[PDB]
Amino acid sequence: PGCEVCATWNADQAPFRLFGNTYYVGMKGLSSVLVTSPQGHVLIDGGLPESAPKIIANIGALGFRIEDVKLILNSHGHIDHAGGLAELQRRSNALVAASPSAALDLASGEVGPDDPQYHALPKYPPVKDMRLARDGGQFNVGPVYLTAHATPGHTPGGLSWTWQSCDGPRCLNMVYADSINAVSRPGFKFSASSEYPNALADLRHSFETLEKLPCDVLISAHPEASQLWQRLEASATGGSDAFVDPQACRAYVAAARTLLDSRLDQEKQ
Template sequence: MLGVVTSLSLAGHVNAAAIDCSYCETWNKPQAPFQIYGNTYYVGPHGLSAVLITSPQGHILIDGALPQSAPMIAKHVEQLGFKMTDVKVILNSHTHYDHAGGIAELQKLSGAKVIASDKAAPVLRSGRVGPDDPQVGHLLPFPGVSNVEALGRRQSIEVGTLQLNVIHTPGHSPGGTSWRWQSCEADRCLNMMYSDSLNAVADSTFKYSGDPRYPAAAKDLTSSMEAIAAAPCDILVTAHPELSGLWATIDERGNGDRAKLNDPAACQRYVATTKQRLDQRLASEKADKK
């Protein structure tokens, strides 16, 4: 979550919530769905990624954007020629309202199983982050997901021929998770990466340099960066698409040169940028103590 919340609008019930924040309108700007590579498709709004990975046996959806994004995401799935009822699993990068807010409605529309990391699962169920989230002071509730399955010790999620491998990436939030898989066109398969946010963003009270609510935040974030940098990565999509340079590479209609998305150095560049931001934040917090 990068925006500042201004209010939460309820349409009769929390599950019909539309969240109003300083960036929400921009994040939820319409975006035509498009093929990223092989069986991987972009189905989110312009400012918040949601990715569909398909197979004949069923599909996997990563992230649900805002509550008000859910109808758009479902429409995009159908526009691409797929059925929402064939989405068998919904995954999440992290439990902030701009990435998890639409999951409850998308689960209702699809009947899919929602699977999340052990720390993220209770937050998804309640729709409220805990006090250990670095942005707790900026975050408002989102529609809780009634049925969430915790990952436990599983290292991958399978649906039919699909296998998505788990990369635990805490730090931006305590239960952050990234996902990697392969997508193929003809006889060429590429390593796909959906990276959770790796930015050290916090409210005005949280300190990455040491906070009793989440003492390991900086250490966790550094380990997460190392994990993403070391993973096989040909095509990177980040939870906020501009952070991986998606729109700089492919035009908004999905009509650009998709071949340019194949960039084996993308994950390492993303990590280098986020590492620099963490270092700057730690230095700033240290200076504030003087």
């Protein structure tokens, strides 16, 4: 009874350092990112419910502990990013930060009628304790300071995150970009939803937001959308330079715009 899509998304990925105190601890098709400090760590996204043990194992393999995670951040409320959150919270006793809209999904373990994939995803374990992250909201664990950027469209509650990571004197701007791809259950119309009427305005404004972010190192919620595995392969002999590309967020938005244009053409004809 295996789901080939979930199986592919959740496939093992050996964890690795991206830049400075920023590490990848996710899976082949779903990102999770660890940002460390001696005062504890920040963890971004939780994958599917069955991703949580893999993320935890990956944190350990790097030489860190889930017990030292003091803040967990969410991108959006779909099961493939929020499903593992309840377990990660239990194992770390960390608070989870999410947008007001995503937090509604997390609290019930299922999305509402305004989600493009409402009625088309399984329920997942509800997240017990949360903090709301609004646009421009700043969060910290010791010296690592994260800023939330509202980037809805793929869901009404989409959030992207920025912070800086340093490898001594050189600092780079890190970006965890939420999904901004216009995909849905069949029959949903981004151009004509009565439950999510702001979908197009959201996507356009998110495109604007993401494309002008300071952006040295990009990790997308679905890693292949930022070519992470090509970049990782390059890093074997290339080093951290392989992950650095100041044009990455602009290219990410350009690709999403292209997808949206095609999608709107399909909805109209």
